Scaffold this active site. Sequence first.
Site, PDB file in Angstrom:
ATOM      1  N   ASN B 199       0.824  -1.204   0.000  1.00 44.12           N
ATOM      2  CA  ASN B 199       0.000   0.000   0.000  1.00 44.12           C
ATOM      3  C   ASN B 199       0.860   1.257   0.000  1.00 44.12           C
ATOM      4  O   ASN B 199       0.485   2.272  -0.597  1.00 44.12           O
ATOM      5  CB  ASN B 199      -0.941  -0.007   1.202  1.00 44.12           C
ATOM      6  CG  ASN B 199      -2.188  -0.834   0.961  1.00 44.12           C
ATOM      7  OD1 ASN B 199      -2.640  -0.981  -0.174  1.00 44.12           O
ATOM      8  ND2 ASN B 199      -2.756  -1.374   2.032  1.00 44.12           N
ATOM      9  N   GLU B 247       1.012 -20.352 -17.745  1.00 43.83           N
ATOM     10  CA  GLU B 247       2.292 -19.956 -18.319  1.00 43.83           C
ATOM     11  C   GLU B 247       3.097 -19.070 -17.377  1.00 43.83           C
ATOM     12  O   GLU B 247       4.330 -19.049 -17.457  1.00 43.83           O
ATOM     13  CB  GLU B 247       2.065 -19.237 -19.649  1.00 43.83           C
ATOM     14  CG  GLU B 247       1.368 -20.093 -20.693  1.00 43.83           C
ATOM     15  CD  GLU B 247       1.242 -19.398 -22.034  1.00 43.83           C
ATOM     16  OE1 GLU B 247       1.861 -18.328 -22.214  1.00 43.83           O
ATOM     17  OE2 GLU B 247       0.524 -19.923 -22.912  1.00 43.83           O
TER      18      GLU B 247
HETATM   19  N1  LIG Z   1      -5.167  -2.550  -1.006  1.00 41.46           N
HETATM   20  C1  LIG Z   1      -6.002  -2.714   0.014  1.00 41.46           C
HETATM   21  N2  LIG Z   1      -5.536  -3.189   1.224  1.00 41.46           N
HETATM   22  C2  LIG Z   1      -6.380  -3.358   2.272  1.00 41.46           C
HETATM   23  C3  LIG Z   1      -7.721  -3.050   2.120  1.00 41.46           C
HETATM   24  N3  LIG Z   1      -8.333  -3.306   3.293  1.00 41.46           N
HETATM   25  C4  LIG Z   1      -7.420  -3.765   4.175  1.00 41.46           C
HETATM   26  N4  LIG Z   1      -6.198  -3.800   3.565  1.00 41.46           N
HETATM   27  C5  LIG Z   1      -4.933  -4.248   4.179  1.00 41.46           C
HETATM   28  O1  LIG Z   1      -5.138  -5.313   5.093  1.00 41.46           O
HETATM   29  C6  LIG Z   1      -4.161  -5.239   6.113  1.00 41.46           C
HETATM   30  C7  LIG Z   1      -4.578  -5.926   7.407  1.00 41.46           C
HETATM   31  O2  LIG Z   1      -5.297  -7.107   7.149  1.00 41.46           O
HETATM   32  P1  LIG Z   1      -6.897  -7.022   7.098  1.00 41.46           P
HETATM   33  O3  LIG Z   1      -7.419  -7.426   5.743  1.00 41.46           O
HETATM   34  O4  LIG Z   1      -7.311  -5.613   7.445  1.00 41.46           O
HETATM   35  O5  LIG Z   1      -7.410  -8.017   8.255  1.00 41.46           O
HETATM   36  P2  LIG Z   1      -8.281  -9.314   7.876  1.00 41.46           P
HETATM   37  O6  LIG Z   1      -7.715  -9.982   6.646  1.00 41.46           O
HETATM   38  O7  LIG Z   1      -9.728  -8.926   7.676  1.00 41.46           O
HETATM   39  O8  LIG Z   1      -8.151 -10.287   9.149  1.00 41.46           O
HETATM   40  P3  LIG Z   1      -8.809  -9.860  10.550  1.00 41.46           P
HETATM   41  O9  LIG Z   1      -7.775  -9.168  11.397  1.00 41.46           O
HETATM   42  O10 LIG Z   1      -9.300 -11.081  11.282  1.00 41.46           O
HETATM   43  O11 LIG Z   1      -9.964  -8.923  10.285  1.00 41.46           O
HETATM   44  C8  LIG Z   1      -3.964  -3.756   6.337  1.00 41.46           C
HETATM   45  O12 LIG Z   1      -2.633  -3.494   6.700  1.00 41.46           O
HETATM   46  C9  LIG Z   1      -4.304  -3.130   5.000  1.00 41.46           C
HETATM   47  O13 LIG Z   1      -3.131  -2.659   4.379  1.00 41.46           O
HETATM   48  C10 LIG Z   1      -8.197  -2.574   0.907  1.00 41.46           C
HETATM   49  O14 LIG Z   1      -9.384  -2.301   0.768  1.00 41.46           O
HETATM   50  N5  LIG Z   1      -7.334  -2.404  -0.144  1.00 41.46           N
END
Ligand SMILES: Nc1nc2c(ncn2[C@@H]2O[C@H](COP(=O)(O)OP(=O)(O)OP(=O)(O)O)[C@@H](O)[C@H]2O)c(=O)[nH]1
Lengths: 432, 432, 430, 430
Positions: B199, B247
Amino acid sequence: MRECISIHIGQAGVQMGNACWELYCLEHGIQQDGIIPDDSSFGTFFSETGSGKHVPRAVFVDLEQTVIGEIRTGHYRSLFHPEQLITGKEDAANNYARGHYTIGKEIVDSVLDRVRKMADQCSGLQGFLIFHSFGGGTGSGFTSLLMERLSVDYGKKSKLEFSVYPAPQISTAVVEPYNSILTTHTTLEHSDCAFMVDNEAIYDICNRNLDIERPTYTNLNRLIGQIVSSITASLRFDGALNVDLTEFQTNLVPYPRIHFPLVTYSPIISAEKAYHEQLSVPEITNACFEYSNQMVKCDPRRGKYMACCLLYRGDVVPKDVNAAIAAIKTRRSIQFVDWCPTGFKVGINYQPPTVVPGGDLAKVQRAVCMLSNTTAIAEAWARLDHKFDLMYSKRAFVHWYVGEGMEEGEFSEAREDMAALEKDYEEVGTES
Amino acid sequence: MRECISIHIGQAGVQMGNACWELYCLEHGIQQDGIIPDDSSFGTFFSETGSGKHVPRAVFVDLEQTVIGEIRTGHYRSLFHPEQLITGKEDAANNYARGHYTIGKEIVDSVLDRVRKMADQCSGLQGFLIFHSFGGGTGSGFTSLLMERLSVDYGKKSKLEFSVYPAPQISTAVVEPYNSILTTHTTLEHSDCAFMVDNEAIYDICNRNLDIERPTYTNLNRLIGQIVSSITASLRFDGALNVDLTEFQTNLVPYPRIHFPLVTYSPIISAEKAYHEQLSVPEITNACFEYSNQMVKCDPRRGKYMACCLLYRGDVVPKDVNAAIAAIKTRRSIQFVDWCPTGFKVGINYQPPTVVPGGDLAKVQRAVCMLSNTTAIAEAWARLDHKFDLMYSKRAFVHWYVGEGMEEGEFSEAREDMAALEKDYEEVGTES
Amino acid sequence: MREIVHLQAGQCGNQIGAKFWEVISDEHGIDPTGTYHGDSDLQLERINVYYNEATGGKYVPRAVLVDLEPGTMDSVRSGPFGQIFRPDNFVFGQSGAGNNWAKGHYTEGAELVDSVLDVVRKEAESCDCLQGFQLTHSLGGGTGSGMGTLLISKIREEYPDRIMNTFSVVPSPKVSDTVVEPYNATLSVHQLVENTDETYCIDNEALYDICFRTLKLTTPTYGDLNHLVSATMSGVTTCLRFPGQLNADLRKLAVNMVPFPRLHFFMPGFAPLTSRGSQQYRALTVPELTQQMFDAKNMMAACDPRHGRYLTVAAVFRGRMSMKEVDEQMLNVQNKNSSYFVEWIPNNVKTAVCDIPPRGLKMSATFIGNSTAIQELFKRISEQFTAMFRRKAFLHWYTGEGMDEMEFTEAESNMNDLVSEYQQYQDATA
Amino acid sequence: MREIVHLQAGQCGNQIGAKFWEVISDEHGIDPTGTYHGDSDLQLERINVYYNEATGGKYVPRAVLVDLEPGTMDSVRSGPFGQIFRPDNFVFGQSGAGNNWAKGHYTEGAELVDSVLDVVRKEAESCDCLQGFQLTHSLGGGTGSGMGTLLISKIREEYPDRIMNTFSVVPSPKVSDTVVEPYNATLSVHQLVENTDETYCIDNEALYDICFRTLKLTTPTYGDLNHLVSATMSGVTTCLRFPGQLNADLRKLAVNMVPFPRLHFFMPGFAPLTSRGSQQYRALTVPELTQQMFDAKNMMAACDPRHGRYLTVAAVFRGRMSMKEVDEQMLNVQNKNSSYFVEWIPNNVKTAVCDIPPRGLKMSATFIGNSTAIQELFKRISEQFTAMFRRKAFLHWYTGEGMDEMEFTEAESNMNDLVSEYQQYQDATA
Ligand SMILES: Nc1nc2c(ncn2[C@@H]2O[C@H](COP(=O)(O)OP(=O)(O)OP(=O)(O)O)[C@@H](O)[C@H]2O)c(=O)[nH]1
Ligand SMILES: Nc1nc2c(ncn2[C@@H]2O[C@H](COP(=O)(O)OP(=O)(O)OP(=O)(O)O)[C@@H](O)[C@H]2O)c(=O)[nH]1
Ligand SMILES: Nc1nc2c(ncn2[C@@H]2O[C@H](COP(=O)(O)OP(=O)(O)O)[C@@H](O)[C@H]2O)c(=O)[nH]1
Ligand SMILES: Nc1nc2c(ncn2[C@@H]2O[C@H](COP(=O)(O)OP(=O)(O)O)[C@@H](O)[C@H]2O)c(=O)[nH]1
Ligand SMILES: [Mg+2]
Ligand SMILES: [Mg+2]
């Protein structure tokens, strides 16, 4: 095609029967008043009359006046011949002895009189359909009487029965183990095959698939109507590879005692949910070989299949049926018995299922019903024998039955007979 | 072309997935209601139905009901089959142990059931696309479960994954080192190649190139949709020198462990800014070989390239592609490894990128995406191992994981496995 | 889905509780009668997190209100907002605690505690997924400490796995509204360290400072300090009620903010806190919002973070906010104040963003900080405890209510170890 | 079809009887004069279960009202609802019983009992299928015990097969409105165990608890406790009067709830019991309804089920109710409280649902429980009986009315065996 008689016994049978005959009227377009709007199919379940009012070829019996009285005053009051609806004066009180020895015999002869007068007025007769419940006095004690009586006067004619087998955990009564086992002892030698169904399983499917949180017996009985309609569709509507009533017993009963094929149906999808589905032939076919879609809460994977009847319905391409069935035969998880290489029986009818007005299930273009016979059902019998042994070990409720003209040894014989049934299932589960 | 399944896991996967499927509907002109306006391409990602409503061939899983509930009530509610959107009852709490041992296994079997029913309804299946995040409980613990489960039941089928690798400096959580490293230990042996994205890098590009000062995840995920769309364009739209899904692994994975090609895309130009640019083939091509245009904030010049896949799109003259690629091979700053003289893989499709309504990026007539695999990524792993060692040295957070049914030695094994990964990268960076 | 059940004990707890539901009911547009009149659908989507439901739209907040004398609760019941609570939830005694911990923990709380669990369990089995309990009390008093610690201990036994966060008032560093605060506070801490997953230490003195220093409003003390507290605790539980880009949770903060089991006493902070008259002379952008979170001017605890080092930090933003600014500023904070954060934890900031802001604002953020500077507070309580106990200042009141002086030594020894543990994490790596 | 004939004896019986018909007449829409004014046809379909008929629409309830002094009955006759009973049914004496069992059983009930059977038989031969008799009395008194036990014994001889259920008031555990309650109660139990198919033991003390604890109404004692009792007994006989998905019956409950002939003393319970002011703060769904049935808070017997184990349990729900919820909750109850149910009976819950609810409600359920905790009650009566009898406290009044002290020993020995039998079923299997 030739006629088949329906006998509805007990509160379960009467209440379930009303759901069935709502479907039949809709399939043939018969008005609830009994008069068809202003053809050869309905003759199997409906009797003709000089007027346009056809009469159902069924008999309703219940030792308690309450259940049938609802039918006698409902919107189907004019559909049934008044003498068919047989009612007693007092309930059997969830007592096998009452419905089989003392009060059951007081009205048994009356029912036979209507069966004979209705059985004699058909040139041919395939057999009898019987709906009852193991967990009642009328549905278990009075049924055993009819099975015995119907075995002598009309021996060598089909006697198919749909039964509400006791659920594994849930229970609406306390004496289910005693009553349920007793009828099995007497009905084993006087029946062709019993289509067991459990309310626990049907409730689970309804909340799991039909996606309605608050079902009721008025809802489940409509689902149970579908399996009956699909089973008997071959006797009414034209279609390639029609399956007659007497064919089920030959295919699904390898041995006289092993005649308990649990029911399965597909697809059970809500109207809104169906718009996101394709409903291909394999999809519905593969939906019947998972323990999450069964009318009896038993896991087929625990045991082994030994016979299966597939009754396809609607616009079906049999080529797809052949391909779909072949795939199921080549999966390790799916396991048939060693001595039955030929373990299927297909059936197709060109009549898609009909939707009851205001019904929950969708208008499927195609459907399938399975009547597989599996040794995994021996688990249910063992559990039932276990519950029975817990009570009768302390002799906890026999005084009710003994006082109703029932000898003490009947409980001893009943369990011993079921004990042999367990061993019979066990031997069939292996290979010699 | 044949189908490919998309599996979206965690808040990152679900939120990112919604951005992707907005693009697919636009590319094929599918209405958000699911009904196409009044062809053979969409079959790879969309399943047909008797009606005109096509169903996406994707599954959404999240242990927290909150994220998916937004989809279930958004303008795409009618697009997804209701059973695909799988939701748990409680979040994994940024805990690898919870999403992998205790709560992850409670819902893992449910996801497989929908994967199998969706995988079985395709004559052929290229593989699975998996979107998740290293820095979550669901996106790291539950993912590892699926990678293991999807490795047995569907072994020898492609499993491509886009992952949100932890950023170098910025961080939205505190336990990223523990969680991120643990999944890498388990996902190394059960994956083909992982398309890492940071990010921090995407934010830098957005402010640096897209020229918008205040981005949000709703904006970045749209950019991430482009790389997915360009990657999978060959499976949908006709074009010379199409590149299939399987591929990528052959070209970009010299060794089983070295399968981390960082993503790159070009051109990322605002609508107004694009009017002052020519967008020649070499211009976009040379824009992907500078450390200022990467989705993972790593400097390629620090390390060495060892494999690169170029997926050109739009009206492209391959002759220019050949000339542009040749120039990059003869620059001292650009450095490939000694033992890979043949270090490119071209791919072209005749379908220019589509612009989401109200989107930021312009309507480019031509675009390119790179999936280079560089040993400079070993720097990121070393940094992550450094942060992990700082915490576990004092044993600062293990009590959360141990109490969730996780053995102590797992942290020891996890770091040792990553330690070998560093040495494996180091050896590949030299010549024998 | 992720249900929370609220507990409030003592005079302070109920009043904080009372203003805790006046805020939430405002967020969800719930009329004091319990009838919904909101405008946005998201309010109903998660209204089941705090409010149950009764036919006709009557929403019943599952709070459990317990006190050893009817005085305070009768005020809440007669309050304008007292018509909402289920009458069966009020658990009232007939002989209140005289600020002595033993009476509210051994002789009087024991008689009334069994009744409360009978009301928690009903609110516990009426939730399809119960996330964790919530408790609001005061350490200084007798009912908020005696029975509060007695009740928190009980709910730990039945619900060991469930979360249990505490918003607790801590004795002020120099002023005191009770003489036996060290005895009561010391026993309470010895009893929370083993049961409570996360505690939010706050004190009136520090919270007074906000009223006149950053705000300019001298008249109120208890009608508004509770409202700042209510806004803070509402921010913590926002992710479970409204959609968010990066949704957080009581368990997510515990894991991020609790490195070791015995280090779980945080100190909250809230922003923006501007006076009505000076509000128009200030920007509401993210950068400025984040600056005041880390200054001891806007810390609701008496302990200044400068004297110590942060172990873990959590921010829960709200409203439509650019996540890039939400993240660039935190990287900025960590580097500018590198001496304020421990090295053995590479990252110390946790972020969470909710789309819906608090009522009357378009931007907000709740700070939660685990700093070793909080050891000063316990160190101070121990100094006061040992001085009084060195001569048996008031032990006769406590011994006479079914207690032993050996427990005081255990409470002092356990407290001394908590101070020592926080002190170990002042040194740098190696 | 399945006719029931009602018997009420003693002062308590008539008053309970009197409020028993004010409820039924309300369900069927029967005017106090006996003229039908109901709205639904189902009321008439089974109106013959309790009410006979006379040309012009006059419906005559076949109750038989018997007492040894005209006092109480004259009040019923002069009551507003006294115009309905057939004047020929009132069987009144001229010398009431002075709470001594012997007088109402040997010397005075004997003279009046023959007259009552002459009135039962007419109501017995006027029914096409007579299901069973119903009796309401009090064990403590003399007329409800002496003649009640004398009458129940007689109707057992002529109608051995027919059902005979008894709703009987049992002496309270600690308070007593009569001094000779142990003598009278002990003799009554020794006489019911051999004749009555099912008995519903209730006591004022436990039923008082409902008034102020779950309801909030202190003023009434006898005008309302009888109304709770009347609603309970009405629930039991609902299946014989209205359609139901799973119709029940007096014989169905006896079989399910009576494992052994001598264990037939149950303890009823009713729900919902909410105060008018707190009713709007409560959901009327099935789950909550079922929770309060199994708590000693809503048990109309003084015995707490927790001290013992359930042998058999019956629920009779009413109204339009989802049978899945009606069944899932019972499975939930059995597993949650597995220690409260005996192992040697695999299933202990019996369910029955009626479509038509009680007047003024859309949901209801009557609990009937056979628990070994009821042995405490008889054990207590024996302790009191042996203490007084150990010194011949009052035997001279009882001996002088045609009785022998040998009968007291038999009543004490038979009672002791009933207590012992209940005790055998506390052990688990094997
Ligand atoms: N590119 C992008 N990254 C995201 C987005 N939402 C969350 N993230 C990334 O996800 C990371 C943390 O993992 P999460 O997806 O928030 O947590 P989770 O997978 O839901 O697992 P839990 O903690 O149990 O909720 C963060 O550091 C964000 O950078 C998104 O909408 N777009
Ligand atoms: N599927 C279904 N099952 C029913 C229905 N009604 C009753 N049952 C089942 O019947 C079982 C008990 O047997 P009953 O039919 O109620 O009793 P009975 O056959 O009338 O015999 P009696 O006890 O003399 O009344 C219950 O456990 C129910 O599961 C119904 O409408 N649909
Ligand atoms: N924030 C806040 N604190 C209060 C309030 N009322 C009392 N307190 C604090 O609570 C402490 C007194 O505790 P109290 O509830 O009276 O003792 P108890 O009820 O007998 O256990 C004092 O130190 C006060 O600072 C209030 O309305 N708001
Ligand atoms: N529930 C109820 N119980 C009553 C009522 N009146 C009397 N009792 C009980 O009946 C007992 C007295 O019995 P009673 O009828 O006076 O004796 P008897 O008529 O001479 O046999 C007392 O223990 C009371 O608790 C009443 O109206 N309702
Ligand atoms: Mg019946
Ligand atoms: Mg999450």
